[PDB]
Design a protein around this ligand. Structure first.
Ligand code: HEC
Ligand code: HEC
Ligand SMILES: Nc1cccc(CNCCOc2cccc(OCc3ccc4ccc(N)nc4c3)c2)n1
Ligand SMILES: Nc1cccc(CNCCOc2cccc(OCc3ccc4ccc(N)nc4c3)c2)n1
Ligand SMILES: [Cl-]
Ligand SMILES: [Cl-]
Lengths: 362, 362
């Protein structure tokens, strides 16, 4: 039956993919070779054209993503030829460098060898290639609490953090056959960081906040026509609210809101003063200003919502059925000031797509 | 079959209601009289105790309501004895007065005679008992655009608005038998209004904004044990964001955000300045401050979220299954700063409850 499920997903993907590429005539002969290759080897290998477009369709079908307007300009890097740890590490180093692009971030995905028969060729442990470590013992909260389990796993493998609030986690991944993953420190020259300042309030610098330039999700599975690419890290650019409203604001993250209220000169005592809402706005203004001043790509949630409406229009113009997750598409700051809040979306899962998968550390 | 459906809803409501009231022993004899009364008359009449508790259960089951903690203190007024237009009008005048309570708003519901066999005894046309009219001809937008259809209907019946931005709509309702509804102007002495000022910014008064004290939803159907109370207006107090983030902020409502940005001294040119978010916060701060200064009940979305968490805890403490509509429970300002944003809710419909019904004007 395992040879059946792949043949069904391949017949659905190839037909849809070749039709969108104007290659509908080449369809039937391609699945003939596919149906053979599956019968013989138990799987099949995508063309570079199928793999590139398949990764673009997967982004187009991500119901929770507000930045899908630019799905067709995704920069796909085919690294299915990788066999060694040094090749994985260099390919990841290269992804960071080419996606960063001196600040003018290029949406990029590096695609590693897919699973054979459920057996992963490379198993990435990082949630994002660039992320800050987190520590909790004592009653000391240091760094990013969301990275607490991964940090504890890295420190069993010989790594040790300086225990600042912004320790860069190392790359950590396991190869097929090896019992334990390897880890490699990130070269600081590859990692752009943005210090958070406010355009009007000079005291905002006293918070000594910063964030990294490029969010590179590295723990999701790309599924294209039945082929399971468990290791395929991708990146866009940040929407400001992800940093200002969640990463630096959540109580279970960096929890900076009352420190923000202090440096902007308002009290944090009464709910009716809306000090949290006011602090959230000034922190988010600071994030956008700081990324723009440094020359690192970022988008505000209003512009992003406008772009997503064009994606909604482009979808209907092309006859494509639009799918979306309202609960994730609305921004966490002023959601009712976007058109997204005032309409409905079908949360149906369409393939190709990106999916969660179990963490190897827990 | 119509005699069947009511017997099923009555057996479910009476059992649940009498169990919660410690009257489980009186259950079986009460439905015996009910089963007879239905066989004879085709319907049945609730006790005052069943009607009061049934209206409280309906509030407890309103998935979209964040203020459900106080469900048990609802003030129920039984007006099933009403037969004339003057009685309806006086009962509505009384509701406004007793719910307003000089500013210390009492959550109140007035319950009118229910539908017979789908035939309404009284048909309320107001969406809320106190609401502002709206006009659109010319290209003139005057008043509340959400009230445009109702205002045009009232003006066919001999009513005429002064065409200010805050014309009080008259009470308008139709009695059984009559072809057209009657309308009665609201006595200004019954209606509390709050002028919107800012605690810090004196120029905010230049906007000349105001809102009414008490939102009294008057077009929903209360369903208790199969009995359909189509006319049963109810009120709580406002959550600040309903006025500051929607009523005065939405582009299809009063659309005041760029006027707010002007009087608070910030530019409304660049999305990355987050001027809409900043204006939303200061407008919402002004709403809360203005209601508190005048002595009219209101709650901020943070306090309301805290109260709703106690309702979640009280529900589990009592063994009640909790239901809720996440998309409506999250506030439109800083939703991720509330616990509601970070959990899930079962949107199952439980009865008794309040339901939409078709407008008679359109
Ligand atoms: C180009 C800039 C870009 C922006 C801005 C962007 N995305 Fe997404 N985006 C996703 C997926 C998948 C999710 C949902 C992940 C999840 O469920 O946790 C997502 C979720 C998001 C979220 C929600 C995050 C949150 O915490 O609520 C935001 C915001 C977002 N995308 C914005 C796939 C992508 C891919 C992959 C090819 C690219 C490139 C991409 N996205 C590019 C972008
Ligand atoms: C005591 C103060 C109180 C507050 C604060 C309160 N409610 Fe609700 N509330 C509802 C219902 C029903 C809805 C959903 C109506 C709808 O679907 O449009 C609701 C919805 C709401 C909403 C959502 C409105 C929006 O536009 O998003 C808020 C906010 C709210 N309630 C707060 C029944 C009630 C009842 C009836 C007995 C009372 C009293 C009541 N509620 C009292 C309160
Ligand atoms: N309860 C709710 C309700 C509504 C919305 C949310 C949002 N959930 C909060 C963030 O928590 C997580 C947890 C796990 C994964 C995760 O992936 C974020 C992500 C993924 C891909 C991106 C691509 C580009 C980009 N710019 N950003 C991206 C962000 C977020 N939670
Ligand atoms: N797309 C979305 C997504 C999420 C949330 C919303 C919220 N929808 C906006 C408001 O639009 C309407 C339309 C029709 C009815 C209505 O009833 C408001 C109401 C009812 C009862 C109340 C009781 C007490 C109280 N204090 N307030 C109340 C408010 C709102 N829309
Ligand atoms: Cl992030
Ligand atoms: Cl309202």
């Amino acid at each position: 039956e395992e040879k059946e499920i792949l043949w069904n997903e391949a017949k659905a993907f190839i037909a849809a993919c070749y039709q969108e590429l104007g290659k509908a005539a080449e369809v039937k002969d391609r699945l003939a070779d596919i149906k053979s290759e599956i019968d013989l080897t138990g799987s099949y290998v995508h063309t570079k054209e199928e793999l590139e477009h398949g990764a673009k369709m997967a982004w187009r079908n991500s119901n929770r993503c507000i930045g899908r307007l630019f799905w067709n300009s995704l920069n796909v890097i085919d690294r299915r030829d990788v066999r060694t740890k040094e090749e994985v590490r260099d390919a990841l180093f290269h992804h960071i460098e080419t996606a960063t692009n001196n600040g003018k971030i290029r949406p990029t995905i590096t695609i590693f060898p897919p699973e054979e028969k459920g057996e992963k060729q490379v198993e990435i442990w990082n949630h994002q290639l660039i992320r800050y470590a987190g520590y909790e013992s004592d009653g000391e909260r240091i760094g990013d609490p969301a990275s607490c389990s991964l940090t504890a796993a890295c420190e069993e493998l010989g790594w040790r953090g300086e225990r600042t609030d912004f320790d860069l986690l190392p790359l950590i991944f396991r190869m097929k056959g090896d019992e334990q993953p390897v880890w490699y420190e990130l070269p600081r020259s590859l990692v752009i960081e943005v210090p958070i300042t406010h355009p009007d309030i000079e005291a905002f610098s006293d918070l000594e906040l910063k964030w990294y330039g490029v969010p590179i999700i590295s723990d999701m599975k790309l599924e294209v026509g039945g082929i399971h690419y468990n290791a395929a890290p991708f990146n866009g650019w940040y929407m400001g609210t992800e940093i200002g409203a969640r990463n630096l604001a959540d109580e279970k993250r960096y929890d900076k809101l009352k420190k923000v209220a202090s440096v902007i000169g308002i009290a944090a005592d009464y709910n009716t003063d809306l000090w949290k809402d006011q602090a959230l706005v000034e922190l988010n203004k600071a994030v956008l200003h700081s990324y723009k001043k440094q020359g690192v790509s970022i988008v505000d949630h209003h512009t992003a919502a406008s772009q997503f409406k064009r994606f909604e229009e482009q979808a209907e113009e092309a006859g494509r059925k639009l799918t979306g997750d309202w609960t994730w598409l609305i921004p966490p700051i002023s959601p009712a000031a976007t058109h997204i809040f005032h309409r409905s979306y079908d949360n149906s899962i369409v393939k190709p797509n990106y999916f969660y998968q179990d963490k190897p550390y827990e």
